[PDB]
Design a protein around this ligand. Sequence first.
Ligand SMILES: O=C(O)CCCC(=O)Nc1ccc(/C=C/c2ccccc2)cc1
Lengths: 218, 213
Amino acid sequence: DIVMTQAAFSNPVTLGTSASISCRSTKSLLHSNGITYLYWYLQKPGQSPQLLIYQMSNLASGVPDRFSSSGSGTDFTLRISRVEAEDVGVYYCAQNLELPPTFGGGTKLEIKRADAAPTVSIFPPSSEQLTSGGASVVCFLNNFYPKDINVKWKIDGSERQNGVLNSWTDQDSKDSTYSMSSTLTLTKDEYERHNSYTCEATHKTSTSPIVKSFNRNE
Amino acid sequence: EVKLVESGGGLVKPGGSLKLSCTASGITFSRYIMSWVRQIPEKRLEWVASISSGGITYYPDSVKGRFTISRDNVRNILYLQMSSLRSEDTALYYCARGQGRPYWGQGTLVTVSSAKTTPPSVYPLAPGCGDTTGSSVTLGCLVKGYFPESVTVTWNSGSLSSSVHTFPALLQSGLYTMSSSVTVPSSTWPSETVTCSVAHPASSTTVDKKLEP
Ligand SMILES: O=C(O)CCCC(=O)Nc1ccc(/C=C/c2ccccc2)cc1
């Protein structure tokens, strides 16, 4: 098979500057008809893969001319001039010279931007959930940069780890930040035996954590 | 106009069979090598099958003997018959005209499982601590206990992607849970309505919550 190799990650790119993604193939993709059968596509969460470039240098429909591709038969580079926030995603090279079809492992484009502390919001279990004997306490830690963050839960001032599940978004297509949801799930009975619940977020922005909290009896 | 449309996906028991179909506007399948390729959570695309213009069929050894690709030249339909299905065949399946300028469809989800299609419970996330909330207010919906993926959470008919965040679903003893948040200026809400609309096509369910102070 023709193996397509590309790096998982690229240099973080500041908005308005260029990015370059490399790929290579074990066999030349130049056909005797003079066309090179390399294509590039972009994957974003929540939508279908989108073709960017085909036959090594031809733009696909809808694709702006800040995208370009060049190469030999075996070594290729996709370039993006003047990167925009919506360009974030995973860029794949692949070949359509021969069967079997083969695909690269994808290169994630990451945008570099200014640091941002998280906006932290805490929510008690909804009455509706409690009626079924469940109790999820949710904390969103939203629109922060860079992506590294930590969350800690306190029930009546005492650290709690069990029952916490975290979910992280990919980089935002509008503001190039990251977000996190953290949920502490407990029975209704254990929820109702404690009063103070707390979410605390630690992020490089501040050496002190942003803490959010409520008291159940209020 | 030019597009491919896959259909036929759904839930199937381990060891079962399922047949996918693909139709097209503007692509005459008989002229091309037509293919099926699938996308599984962690991974780059995986090739499943191809059929040449002359009807010759090609498979990876991973599905050979279980999957069959065929084409109805006259009606212009592409098929993938799958048998002896395994949990590992769980994927989004795409038909593709891969030659030249590749075209592919939106894909159709096949889930190989003994589990039962289960609708979400949807809980509102509104501030309730003390009665204070800042310049901007963050609201959400917690979507719990559904199977399979996926759900779509739409805020005010999509008018608010006013910092909408969609958090990836997490699996927990058989069922999925996800959440979605939106941020609006405090001048707008609660003085105007904010609603989360949670669509779960697989269970034929939509749930809307109007968030309340
Ligand atoms: O003409 C020849 O002999 C060679 C043709 C080989 C061929 O069809 N390759 C080929 C087959 C399928 C694909 C599919 C790509 C794809 C990419 C993203 C989403 C869904 C599908 C891409 C390439």
